[PDB]
Design an enzyme around this catalytic site. Structure first.
Site, PDB file in Angstrom:
ATOM      1  N   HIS A  87       1.018  -1.332  -0.203  1.00  0.00           N
ATOM      2  CA  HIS A  87      -0.027   0.001  -0.055  1.00  0.00           C
ATOM      3  C   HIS A  87       0.763   1.058  -0.131  1.00  0.00           C
ATOM      4  CE1 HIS A  87      -3.175  -2.930   0.998  1.00  0.00           C
ATOM      5  NE2 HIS A  87      -2.536  -3.189   2.009  1.00  0.00           N
TER       6      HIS A  87
ATOM      7  N   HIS B 227       5.148   6.822   7.118  1.00  0.00           N
ATOM      8  CA  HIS B 227       4.992   6.393   5.629  1.00  0.00           C
ATOM      9  C   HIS B 227       4.049   7.677   4.890  1.00  0.00           C
ATOM     10  CE1 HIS B 227       1.143   5.811   7.737  1.00  0.00           C
ATOM     11  NE2 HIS B 227       0.648   6.542   6.772  1.00  0.00           N
TER      12      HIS B 227
ATOM     13  N   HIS C 292       1.605   9.305   1.685  1.00  0.00           N
ATOM     14  CA  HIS C 292       0.687   8.832   0.509  1.00  0.00           C
ATOM     15  C   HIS C 292       0.861  10.079  -0.525  1.00  0.00           C
ATOM     16  CE1 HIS C 292      -1.864   6.901   3.452  1.00  0.00           C
ATOM     17  NE2 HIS C 292      -1.218   7.662   4.207  1.00  0.00           N
TER      18      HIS C 292
ATOM     19  N   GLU D 199      -3.818  13.374   1.692  1.00  0.00           N
ATOM     20  CA  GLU D 199      -5.251  12.716   2.120  1.00  0.00           C
ATOM     21  C   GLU D 199      -5.943  13.880   2.773  1.00  0.00           C
ATOM     22  OE1 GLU D 199      -4.093   9.346   4.420  1.00  0.00           O
ATOM     23  OE2 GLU D 199      -4.913   8.304   2.492  1.00  0.00           O
TER      24      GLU D 199
ATOM     25  N   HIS E 116       2.793  10.865   7.167  1.00  0.00           N
ATOM     26  CA  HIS E 116       2.395  10.482   8.415  1.00  0.00           C
ATOM     27  C   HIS E 116       3.221   9.818   9.495  1.00  0.00           C
ATOM     28  CE1 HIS E 116      -1.756  10.302   6.320  1.00  0.00           C
ATOM     29  NE2 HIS E 116      -1.486  11.351   6.652  1.00  0.00           N
TER      30      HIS E 116
ATOM     31  N   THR F   5      -6.593   6.311   8.152  1.00  0.00           N
ATOM     32  CA  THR F   5      -7.084   6.370   6.801  1.00  0.00           C
ATOM     33  C   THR F   5      -6.898   5.203   5.926  1.00  0.00           C
ATOM     34  OG1 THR F   5      -5.050   7.000   5.717  1.00  0.00           O
ATOM     35  CG2 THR F   5      -6.299   8.742   6.910  1.00  0.00           C
TER      36      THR F   5
HETATM   37 ZN   LIG Z   1      -1.146   7.539   6.331  1.00  0.00          ZN
END
Ligand SMILES: [Zn+2]
Ligand SMILES: C[C@H](CNC(=O)c1ccc(S(N)(=O)=O)cc1)Cn1ccc2ccccc21
Ligand code: NA
Length: 257
Positions: free
Chosen positions: A61, A91, A93, A103, A116, A195
């Site tokens: 992911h 990590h 996104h 996000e 994050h 999330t």
């Molecule tokens: Zn995250």
């Protein structure tokens, strides 16, 4: 089988994870004109001097940089938080193009990516117990925009070739997460959730107002990662973000006037 594609992405998650439609889901749009300054909010205390990174993992992911959280080394406290929260992993996104990837949004603006830094409340003893509590986690979110390179990110960028596919990891010791912070610690905060599935409603979100700048070349390397495992058809790891969710009965507070 959850993911980010048409057939298993955010619009599908509620079938296996009905909390996806819950009362405190993340991310959200931060409407800057209605986020009231709260003078009772304390400065954020980010104490990362003793952080011990261990490993970097492509989990299918995103990629996680993992830390030794067996003692009160790298901790977050202050701000909206009561007590002490230990850093366990960070990590990102990110998007397929620079105009999307974050996000959280700010007045509907999407940033190119979002970092994050995930922390758990030490009063609950382990991360697994913390995610059974409404104040179990604190996530520090930092926006990324594309401009000048971020020097403190380059060691991450350079190891990504070695964890291209799901399930690959590499030793990643002696990484200093202080190099990923912006100058200012001014923030917005609100109660929310993870999330990604299982979407648990444990998180005090702390989203910094000041983005960090990364170079086009740095984010391009993120976009060469793969969601798939080795030997499988190549699906580029891009657009691994959940869109903004309904704010419902919540208030976003600003730490700054
Ligand atoms: Zn995250
Ligand atoms: C929940 C856990 C897997 N998920 C996460 O740890 C997680 C962390 C942060 C975010 S985000 N994107 O909101 O920062 C999302 C998911 C598994 N697990 C369960 C018990 C233990 C372990
Ligand atoms: Na408000």
């Amino acid at each position: 089988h959850w993911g980010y594609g048409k057939h298993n992405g955010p619009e599908h998650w509620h079938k296996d994870f009905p909390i996806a439609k819950g009362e405190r889901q993340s991310p959200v749009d931060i409407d800057t004109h209605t986020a009231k300054y709260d003078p009772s909010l304390k400065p954020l205390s980010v104490s990362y001097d003793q952080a011990t990174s261990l490993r970097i993992l492509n989990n299918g992911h995103a990629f996680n940089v993992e830390f030794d959280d067996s003692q009160d080394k790298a901790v977050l406290k202050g701000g909206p938080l009561d007590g002490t929260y230990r850093l366990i992993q960070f990590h990102f996104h990110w998007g397929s193009l620079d105009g999307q990837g974050s996000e959280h949004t700010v007045d509907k603006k999407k940033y190119a990516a979002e970092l994050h830094l995930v922390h758990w409340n030490t009063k609950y003893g382990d991360f697994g117990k913390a995610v059974q509590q409404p104040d179990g986690l604190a996530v520090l979110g930092i926006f990324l925009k594309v401009g000048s390179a971020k020097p403190g990110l380059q060691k991450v960028v350079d190891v990504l070739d070695s964890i291209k596919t799901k399930g690959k990891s590499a030793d990643f010791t002696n990484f200093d997460p202080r190099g990923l912070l912006p100058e200012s610690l001014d923030y917005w905060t609100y109660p929310g959730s993870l999330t990604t599935p299982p979407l648990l409603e444990c998180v005090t979100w702390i989203v910094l107002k000041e983005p960090i700048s990364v170079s086009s070349e740095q984010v391009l390397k993120f976009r060469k990662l793969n969601f798939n495992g080795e030997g499988e058809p190549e699906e580029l790891m891009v657009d691994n973000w959940r869109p903004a969710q309904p704010l419902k009965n919540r208030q976003i507070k600003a730490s700054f006037k």
